Symmetry: none
Amino acid sequence: HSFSFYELKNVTNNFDERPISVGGNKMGEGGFGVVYKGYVNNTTVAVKKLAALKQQFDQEIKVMAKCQHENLVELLGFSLCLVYVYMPNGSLLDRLSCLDGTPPLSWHMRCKIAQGAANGINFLHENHHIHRNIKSANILLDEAFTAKISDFGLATVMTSRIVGTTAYMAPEALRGEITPKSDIYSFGVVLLEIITGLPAVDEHREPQLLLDIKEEIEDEEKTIEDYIDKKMNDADSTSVEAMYSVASQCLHEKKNKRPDIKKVQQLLQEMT
Amino acid sequence: HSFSFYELKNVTNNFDERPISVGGNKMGEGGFGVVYKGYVNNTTVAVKKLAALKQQFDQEIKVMAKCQHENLVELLGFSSDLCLVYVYMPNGSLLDRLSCLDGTPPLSWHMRCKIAQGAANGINFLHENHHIHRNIKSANILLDEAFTAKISDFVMTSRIVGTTAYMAPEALRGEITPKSDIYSFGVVLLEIITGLPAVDEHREPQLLLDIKEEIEDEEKTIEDYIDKKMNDADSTSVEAMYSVASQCLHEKKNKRPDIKKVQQLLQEMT
């Protein structure tokens, strides 16, 4: 679908730069532009106005055209601007950290979100795309807390342009390779966030990278039990250990030793 | 020791920016400056003129005053009118010698082993004095007239720019630690074995450290990669050094040996 630039301008209050916290329309910065909350028809939408180009714009639509799935953020249209289905519950990162005082997600709900995110990655890989920025801040949650993968801004093959969020990036990705195996790795870090409720990096924490508690648990210096988010009351040890096992396998340093997204799906389905 | 800026200017030919190989005095660019060949007082010297602070100029002179060792490049003095003066290493870098730059003969296997040892010693001295080098690579390993190894020059969405070829994964993430120095040294051992450069944009694989995966997966053997420009490499000792290299190149920083263990394994090897 195609929107008028006039409409977008106004339904977002001329791109009001103030945070929604204050009553403005500014929802975030990312995906190479700024994201404003807007109202089209009687439905709320997310409006990205591009900033640091046109290649990025055409490319983002080309990838959106092939990839629509239940667990991916649906591109509604365009206008220079882009328009998405609005997800009222924000990022998985926000919810895990209970930002703004929202209630901690239950284990059952966390499990659903992990299955959802994985089905949406499985759809990307089936259709031969790579996301390259799988991280909890890019997993959105709609009104039902369905996982919706977002910010397709970055979606043997090498690249001179190495990019991603380094706390989530696989070692071959860090070196510049481009392969679906790296998405799996990043998803491993996302699972660790879900199990623990801890951010992927914490300057003031030992270890600073969440992905490093994997070694701590292998060397038996720690246990999964030690790291399980305490902000829930329904997380039985069997299914928690089941999900940690998946995370562990995603986090293998040798890309070929990693599960493909489909056995990731199978393992999280078996989890419940 | 301390120098005159103009005597330094004089003996470097007005700091002739042209490279040595066409008759200038520029040897390289590094350590936040340009390095020139100079001569004075019956001493050939290397001069690094800092370019765009003085705390840092005085901060290295601290580091250098402490760290004097047979396998570290020695600081001879300084000028503040900004220049650091070093001992000149007439056989240039390990990289140059591995690549037989300018027609120089290949280094034998036996010599390569000595150099590997010498570098591990210099790295050991650094880590014992709680120093992270951050830039172990074969172009930073100089060779003196006797081919003694002299070590020298010591998270939202983003893109990396750092020279991936030598850097460990945790270092690319931003961690700063001596276990990274070890990983880089592993790449250097692979250079010593293969004669190959760490990265080659027109090679499969581009990064040298990837042959470790090729070998583990039994798609290749370390023999297939042995520098053919040697006639004294016995497979037993080569396989020994390769094993040291493989361990340094461990993907998780805590499974790698510390520099003391690298010294031992390298010693047993001869």
